[PDB]
C-alpha cells in the first residue's frame, strides 16, 4: 500500500486550527484546547500506538475521547468505515481536515455509504470500481462484513 | 395535568420574527427559510414529532425532520441527544433557541447542556441538587441511564 502514502503525507501545519469542519457534535472542548493541528495529530498517533487487541474497541474509543477530544460515537463510525483498520485512522482526519469534508469521499481504505451500496451490485463494472479504489484485499474483507 | 414547565412550551411564535437570527444556513436548509412565519414552522414540527416512531427509529425521525421542516440532520441529531431522546421537548428547544438567541438554550428543563452533563458525573452533591431542580428526578435518572 506504499502507493497510498500520499494520502498520509498531508502536513498538519497547512491546516489552520481548528478546522471549520471541526464542530461541537463531533469534538469535545479538550479538542479545541489543542494549540495546532499538529498537536492533535501527534496525540492521535500516540493514542492509537497503544496496544489494542481486536477485542478492545470500547477502551479505544474511550481513550480517544479522553486523550484527544474526539467524541466517542464519532470514533465509532470512523473505525467502522475504516473496516476497523487503526492504521488508516490518522488518514481519515488529515483528509477530513485538509479538504474540509466528513467523510473524505475519495480515499482508499475509507468506505463511504455509496461504496457500501456498491457492494450489493452484480455489475462487473461496479465491483471493478471498488477494487480500483480500495484494493483487492480491502474489498474481499469488506464483503465478509457485508455478508454478516 | 399542570406543570410550571409550561412557560417554556407556550411561548407565542408570533412574537418571534421569522426567520430568527440564530437560524443559520449551517443549521437549517432552504425549505426552512421558506416557511412564512415561526408558527408555520412550529406546526410542521408538531406534525412530524407527533408521528409514530419506535425507540429504534431515530434515523427516520431525523430524515423526516430534514425533509419536512428543513432541519439539517446533524443538528436534529445533536438535539435528540440534548433531549435524552424525548421527542416532546423538540418544540420547546426551538421556541427558546429562537426567543433567546442561544443554541442550545442553556436554562430549560429537559434540555441537557454540556455543563449539565459535567455536573451529573461530578458527584458534587450541590451541583446535582441543582440538576434535579432543573430537570427533575425522572429526567435525572433517565440521563444517568443515558450514561451506562
Amino acid at each position: 500500500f506504499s502507493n497510498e502514502d500520499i494520502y498520509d503525507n498531508i502536513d498538519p501545519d497547512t491546516i489552520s486550527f481548528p478546522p471549520k469542519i471541526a464542530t461541537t457534535d463531533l469534538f469535545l472542548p479538550l479538542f479545541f484546547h489543542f494549540g495546532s493541528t499538529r498537536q492533535f495529530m501527534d496525540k492521535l498517533h500516540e493514542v492509537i500506538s497503544g496496544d489494542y487487541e481486536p477485542s478492545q474497541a470500547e477502551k479505544l474509543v474511550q481513550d480517544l475521547c479522553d486523550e484527544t477530544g474526539i467524541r466517542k460515537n464519532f470514533s465509532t463510525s470512523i473505525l467502522t468505515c475504516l473496516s476497523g483498520d487503526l492504521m488508516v485512522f490518522p488518514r481519515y482526519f488529515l483528509n477530513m481536515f485538509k479538504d474540509n469534508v466528513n467523510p473524505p469521499p475519495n480515499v482508499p481504505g475509507i468506505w463511504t455509504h455509496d461504496d457500501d451500496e456498491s457492494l450489493k451490485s452484480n455489475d462487473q463494472e461496479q465491483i471493478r470500481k471498488l477494487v480500483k479504489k480500495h484494493g483487492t484485499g480491502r474489498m474481499e474483507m469488506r464483503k465478509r462484513f457485508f455478508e454478516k | 395535568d399542570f406543570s410550571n414547565e409550561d412557560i417554556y412550551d407556550n411561548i407565542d411564535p408570533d412574537t418571534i420574527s421569522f426567520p430568527p437570527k440564530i437560524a443559520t444556513t449551517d443549521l437549517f436548509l432552504p425549505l426552512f427559510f421558506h416557511f412564512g412565519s415561526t408558527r408555520q414552522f412550529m406546526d410542521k414540527l408538531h406534525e412530524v414529532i407527533s408521528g409514530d416512531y419506535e425507540p429504534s427509529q431515530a434515523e427516520k425521525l431525523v430524515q423526516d425532520l430534514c425533509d419536512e421542516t428543513g432541519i439539517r440532520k446533524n443538528f436534529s441529531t445533536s438535539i435528540l441527544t440534548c433531549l435524552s431522546g424525548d421527542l416532546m421537548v423538540f418544540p420547546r428547544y426551538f421556541l427558546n433557541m429562537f426567543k433567546d438567541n442561544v443554541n442550545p438554550p442553556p436554562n430549560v428543563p429537559g434540555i441537557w447542556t454540556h455543563d449539565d452533563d459535567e455536573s451529573l458525573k461530578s458527584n458534587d452533591q450541590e451541583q446535582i441538587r441543582k440538576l434535579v431542580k432543573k430537570h427533575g428526578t425522572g429526567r435525572m435518572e433517565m440521563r444517568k441511564r443515558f450514561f451506562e
Binding site: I48, S55, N73 | P55, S56, G85
Partner: peptide, 20 residues
C-alpha cells in the same frame, strides 16, 4: 492493528440514540 469488526458494529448500534 485491527479492531474486531463485530465489537465495533455493535458498539455503533449501542451508541445510537433511542427515541423515548
Amino acid at each position: 492493528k485491527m479492531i474486531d469488526f463485530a465489537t465495533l458494529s455493535k458498539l455503533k448500534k449501542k451508541y445510537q440514540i433511542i427515541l423515548d
